[PDB]
Amino acid sequence: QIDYRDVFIEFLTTFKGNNNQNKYIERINELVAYRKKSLIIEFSDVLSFNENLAYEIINNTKIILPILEGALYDHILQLDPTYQRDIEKVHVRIVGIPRVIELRKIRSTDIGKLITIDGILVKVTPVKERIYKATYKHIHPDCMQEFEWPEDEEMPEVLEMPTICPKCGKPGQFRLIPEKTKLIDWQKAVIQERPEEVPSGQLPRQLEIILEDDLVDSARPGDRVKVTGILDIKQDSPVKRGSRAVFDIYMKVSSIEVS
Amino acid sequence: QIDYRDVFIEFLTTFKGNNNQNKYIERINELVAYRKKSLIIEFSDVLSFNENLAYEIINNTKIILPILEGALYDHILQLDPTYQRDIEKVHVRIVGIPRVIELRKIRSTDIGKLITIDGILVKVTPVKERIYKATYKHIHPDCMQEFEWPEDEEMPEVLEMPTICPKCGKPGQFRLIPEKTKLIDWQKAVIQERPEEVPSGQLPRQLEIILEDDLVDSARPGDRVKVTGILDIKQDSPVKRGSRAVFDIYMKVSSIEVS
Amino acid sequence: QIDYRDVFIEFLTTFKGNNNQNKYIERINELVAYRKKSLIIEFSDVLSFNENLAYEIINNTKIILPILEGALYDHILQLDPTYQRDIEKVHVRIVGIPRVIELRKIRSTDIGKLITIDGILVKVTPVKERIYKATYKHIHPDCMQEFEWPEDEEMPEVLEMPTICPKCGKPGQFRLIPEKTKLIDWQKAVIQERPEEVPSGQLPRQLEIILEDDLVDSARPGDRVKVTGILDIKQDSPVKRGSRAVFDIYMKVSSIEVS
Amino acid sequence: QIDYRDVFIEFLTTFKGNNNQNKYIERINELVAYRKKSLIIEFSDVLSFNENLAYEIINNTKIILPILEGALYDHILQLDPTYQRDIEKVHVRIVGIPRVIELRKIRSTDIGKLITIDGILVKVTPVKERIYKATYKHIHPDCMQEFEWPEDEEMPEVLEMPTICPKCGKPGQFRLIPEKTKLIDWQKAVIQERPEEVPSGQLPRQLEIILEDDLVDSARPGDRVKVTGILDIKQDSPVKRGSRAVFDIYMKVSSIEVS
Amino acid sequence: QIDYRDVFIEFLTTFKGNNNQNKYIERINELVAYRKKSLIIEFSDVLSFNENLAYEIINNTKIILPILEGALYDHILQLDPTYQRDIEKVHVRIVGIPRVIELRKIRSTDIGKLITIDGILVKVTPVKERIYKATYKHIHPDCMQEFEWPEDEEMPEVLEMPTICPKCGKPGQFRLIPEKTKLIDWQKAVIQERPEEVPSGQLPRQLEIILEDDLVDSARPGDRVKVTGILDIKQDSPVKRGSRAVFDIYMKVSSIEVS
Amino acid sequence: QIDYRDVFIEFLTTFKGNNNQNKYIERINELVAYRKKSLIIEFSDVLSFNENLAYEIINNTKIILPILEGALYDHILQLDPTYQRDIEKVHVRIVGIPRVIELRKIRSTDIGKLITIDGILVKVTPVKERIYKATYKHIHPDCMQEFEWPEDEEMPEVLEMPTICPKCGKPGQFRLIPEKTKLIDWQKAVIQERPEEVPSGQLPRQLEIILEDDLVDSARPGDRVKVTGILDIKQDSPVKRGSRAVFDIYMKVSSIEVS
Numbered sequence A, B, C, D, E, F: 001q002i003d004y005r006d007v008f009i010e011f012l013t014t015f016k017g018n019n020n021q022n023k024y025i026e027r028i029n030e031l032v033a034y035r036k037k038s039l040i041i042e043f044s045d046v047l048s049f050n051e052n053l054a055y056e057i058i059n060n061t062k063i064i065l066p067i068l069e070g071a072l073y074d075h076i077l078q079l080d081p082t083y084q085r086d087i088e089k090v091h092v093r094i095v096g097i098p099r100v101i102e103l104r105k106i107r108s109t110d111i112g113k114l115i116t117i118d119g120i121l122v123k124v125t126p127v128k129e130r131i132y133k134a135t136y137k138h139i140h141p142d143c144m145q146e147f148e149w150p151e152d153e154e155m156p157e158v159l160e161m162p163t164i165c166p167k168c169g170k171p172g173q174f175r176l177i178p179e180k181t182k183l184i185d186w187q188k189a190v191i192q193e194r195p196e197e198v199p200s201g202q203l204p205r206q207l208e209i210i211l212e213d214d215l216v217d218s219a220r221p222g223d224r225v226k227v228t229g230i231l232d233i234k235q236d237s238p239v240k241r242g243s244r245a246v247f248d249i250y251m252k253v254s255s256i257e258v259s
Ligand SMILES: [Zn+2]
Pocket: A138, A140, A143, A144, A145, A165, A166, A167, A168, A169, A170
């Protein structure tokens, strides 16, 4: 009904700020100049410029975010096509949202909303790679062809491969082709309740968080962090019956500020 | 034959109490004002006002409780429709029943009855989420559709997924869609015999209990608690032959009073 | 050929005892009055009244015992039908048999006979529940019906579920319905050779024993016990090939006297 | 061609011995009187009475031994049919054979011959039970019948169950019926090189041995034993490809003398 | 469009160097004389002689390198056909590239490019062998033929064997024939951040590197090394669903200089 | 083209040696007299008498060795037919070849050649047995027959069993029949770099070697040995995809000289 791309682009270009300057235009400039790949937009700024947009961001997130990103990417190549063939996705990273929840108080009604948590980062894995699109090769004498996997969809956390080959239509052996697989940087990090928040006698609760892409290694153990992201439930052996039915919560991280 | 809703509603509205006041009317007021989502009704009060109702509560529980909850919900929206779109279920939490069983004395004739156990809470997990309705997506080129799973029925503790797709009627791969899955807050807690009750020379017995929704984190290790709920047998690998046949008992907790 | 029910019933009603009283009639009275669910009959008494019956008891046990139990149940309901709908099986617990075997001396020819072992109880699990009759639900759009499982037969220690559904005849997913499942109280305990019986230099041998129903918690670690029951071999992953073929012995306990 | 039963029976009845007495007649008498279930025959005695027989024993063993046993059993029931319904197999246990091999020196050419080893017993398991004939029950609505398993053959160490039901001829679920399964007492024991035989600098080699039936618990850790039996190769996960191909040697024990 | 073989060959033959000598011609001479099997070419030299080629090397690597290698092999056999039947592939090892990345700074956009890392070798496995071409035998009464496996393609790190036999066309058991298998020398080593580069408080990150063929054993633990090669993701149980989707990075090493 | 048997036989009979004696004729005499079953021929002697033969031995080994063994066996039975029915194969064990490789220097160009390694034996397993021909029995009511397995071929290190029964041609369950299985004596031994050869600062490398038949227990931990044999790659889980592709090297030992 109403194009949020336009409003977003207008927002970045028009929004004044504190000293009648052009925050965001300036920010995007620093972004192109350094081939960094994320734009940090301050929430209160959006709401101020437009509440319809602010609303979407908090409540729609999953869809709108990629729309806004797609728009930003376009805007950038329009300023510097050289950015292409270096960076291919951009990331709109929302910060400073009113939605601050103490870690202990997270409940069911918070899954799927964009929220913020304040804690101490106590653990981070080394940087690893997640597949977001695979290439398989159908090992079968009559096919032997390659194809991108989850077609028009991203690979789920769990990793799946086709039953039936979409090039020949027959079942069989499929081999992953890593050199043709698209990867995204990935890091698991554990955050815990700040000491001040821990009811006496009790041990601090933790929350697994996932940092991807340029978010990776953006803070270290001991740091105090505001992490902003969307909560979800995490899986290892799903689709298998056996038992479970009970899930841990983790945050897919959208933005992070340190100390 | 006899509408318990009416009697329950009448009960809440007519029952006087100790000071010729209207306990329950007052309670429900405090419930709306604070958007809390449980009503605590004292058992002895019910029995007093009506023994037919009391009986049902202890012996029918599984069905009747939701009847009473449905009635309560109705009564509340009738006072304040704003309660809608904040809370959608209410939980009627019964307290103070005459049915107090010493943990060590629990036997098979007790499974399925609403009972009460007094003990010391020695362990609590952090809060997790239990699926009570999933959405799967049939990964199959010919379908690729979504559906709520256990249809007209809640998900078992164990987690199952269909063999045959209710949308296309064919078998295959099913993927869980968490963003569309209904979740309820969940916590396992271990409760143990009160020292006064442990026969000398022997080790205290323990009992796993499950706290769901707003019961979650309502007490902490070291607290003395009266937990009221329904006993059941707990599973990890069921439907699987191999061995077992022997099950642990746990309490599905209905209400909890602290220290 | 010869009805043991009659003889048993006659035995309980006629057998005099030490003071020309009616032990057994008296015992059964105490049984009804207290809703206890086991009758203890002294072996030497039986043999005395009838050797044919005594013989069966020791050597036929597996079948005859339930005959005798069936008979006792009938007799009881004939005195007080109120016993129904409280207790539904009875338990004839035989005591003081001449067949006392040293734990270390048990051999294959002993499996399946009613025997007695004298030892020190060293471990007891808490009380769990065994399934003796399940209810499954055939998860299938076309059926979705319930049925009691092992039909006209008890559940084996191992837990099985049907291949083919006896309501619709087709195969598929079956889900256990605990609230409709029959349960029996269950306790594993370990018993070990009396120090007096352990040859010097060597470690005491042990024997797993199972206590069901009202035998549960009838003795504690450190107690000296005479357990009377039937030996059998114990299973965890059977029907599976792989290896095994070698089994542990355990006693299914019929009666127990402490210290 | 030549009936070894006759010769064996004649041997036991005729063989004089040292003081013109009837060793063996005497031995078998002590056997019936005590319901013991093994006859110890001295090798040198056999060879002396008949070398054709002696030869068979050492070289044919596997078959001839059961022939000799079958003959002995017959001979015994002929003296005392009461022995029936107590003992059903007997065991001819050969002792004092010329074939003494040092444990370290066992090689391929010794597998399948009856040999003797002298060592120190360093380990024995508790007594367990091996299945030598199973009873399965075909769990299938159309059959539901029982049958003895390996038909006209003993169960291999490994434990197998039928693919196709020999009562109905269809495949499916088969459940073991323990109460109807024939068992044999079983004990694994480890024997090692005597210190005097151990080349200096090197650690003692061991040999797993299996003791069945009345051989069980016939010696304890620390004992010096001459064990006489047939060597074989031992399996856990056989029939499965994967790897292995390399096997340990164990002795199926035929007789044992202590210290 | 433009033959890099010619340019490469021209490069090696024409490129002068520092003293108007013919570095490369000289290098290749030393290569033939000693039956060494790798030519080290200095990057800055290439760029200088031709930037189009330099570009390919850094950015195309995966394809171009084998082109260049093929070309070098031809050139060599043209000077000394005796080199055949000793060495069959050559290895063009590129050194001194401008693309030096800090180990901790590696990201997804780096996978697949030829890069250099500077670190401390902390671990090396012994030398093992990798299969690059297998020979299987189709164990089948009707075939029983041999064939080289991945046809016209190298063996993936993971090892696969055909579904369908390319000699008979039918499926079945395939057995590896090592004596007919092509092997390459292989060594896993771990490399870690230089102390100078490890931010205070934090633990050094590490990187798995693989050394093949004549690179094997070319450095030892404690050595400071500049490794140049291509990053890739590493696999152990891939093609299997279950979970993962998350991968470690390792470098497939093209050249290495010590301390 | 040229019969090596003749040359070998001539070699053994004509070759003089150091004192114009007949080394080898003498050796073979000592072989018959003691029913030992290996002949040790010194390499340099062969080369001296005939270089064509020497060449074959080093480079053809796999075939030629058994040719030479067959010839030797013939020659022996011709001197003493009594050697038959004691020994049925002879093993020609070559010693003192010029091909001595330092353990650390072993590379892929060495696999498949007969080589020599000098080292310290640090570990030996006890003696075990390797199948070189199995007998399976097709467990199937319609067959139930026995057959030698790998037909006209030795069992791979890995152990396989047929998919289709060569007796009836149908698939199913196969059971190994050890009493009818051919076995060869087997010992794994670990050999390590001589201290003099270990580069300072680094850890000694090791090499698994396999001793079969009469080589078994021919040396003990701490012995310095020259082992001569053929290198190969070793397997545990092969034919299985998953990963690997990387293999350890081991020596299949042909001869061993101690200290
Ligand atoms: Zn295909």
